[PDB]
Design a binder for these strands. Structure first.
Lengths: 48, 104, 48
RNA sequence: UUUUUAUUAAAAAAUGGUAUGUUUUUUUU
């Protein structure tokens, strides 16, 4: 950009793209479930 | 929930879902020669038409010769005698068919 | 459910046999099977 | 004909278990 509007500190997620993308392979079960659950919360947020 | 396998929601069942692949699924001439005869008759008729074209070309040559003799329009070489030479052609081709039937 | 994505509740529980009829429409008898219709097809072209 | 991927949960209060109701004034003339 080079020009913006100075969001608040808590309005910058910093890792949202980590779970918006696909899960990396060979991860344990709990990590895959965590990716999926965070994605589910985001989808519910966008739907409403 | 996926490819027709699974339950709509794991709530209400004592399970977590988690469908698995089976991992043990067994993934296993012509009878009426008159056709050829009629085709031969048709091609003979077309050969006759070809000879009629040759007759027309000879007629053009005759017209040119008549015009040259006048110098010393369009004319026709033979009105019906070509049909008699065609009759000779019919006789020759009938002889050829008889010989071919003799050979077979 | 896309197998890497979230899973929600049905949102439409009206699928009982109220018609009580297979409708002689979706029956195997009059259907050419070539390849299975995956759910990816049902999501990519939802109206067809 | 070669390969797969899919993982619900989850703790606190009151019911529920040492009821409850009572209980000390400065004038007469």
């Amino acid at each position: 950009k080079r020009s913006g509007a100075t969001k608040r500190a808590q309005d910058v997620p910093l890792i949202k793209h980590w779970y918006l993308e696909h899960c990396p392979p060979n991860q344990p079960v709990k990590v895959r479930v965590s990716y999926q659950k965070l994605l589910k919360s985001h989808v519910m947020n966008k739907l409403h | 929930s996926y490819n027709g396998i699974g339950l709509p929601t794991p709530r209400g069942s004592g399970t977590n879902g988690y469908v698995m692949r089976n991992l043990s699924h067994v993934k296993k001439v012509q009878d009426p020669s008159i056709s050829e005869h009629e085709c031969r008759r048709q091609i003979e008729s077309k050969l006759l038409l070809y000879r009629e074209q040759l007759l027309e070309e000879v007629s053009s040559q005759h017209s040119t010769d008549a015009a040259a003799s006048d110098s010393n329009s369009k004319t026709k070489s033979l009105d019906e005698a070509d049909v008699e030479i065609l009759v000779q052609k019919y006789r020759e081709q009938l002889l050829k068919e008889l010989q071919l039937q003799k050979s077979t | 459910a896309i197998p890497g994505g979230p899973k929600f509740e049905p949102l439409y529980k009206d699928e009982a046999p109220e018609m009580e009829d297979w409708n002689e429409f979706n029956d195997i008898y009059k259907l050419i099977i070539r390849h299975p219709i995956k759910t990816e097809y049902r999501i990519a072209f939802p109206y067809l």
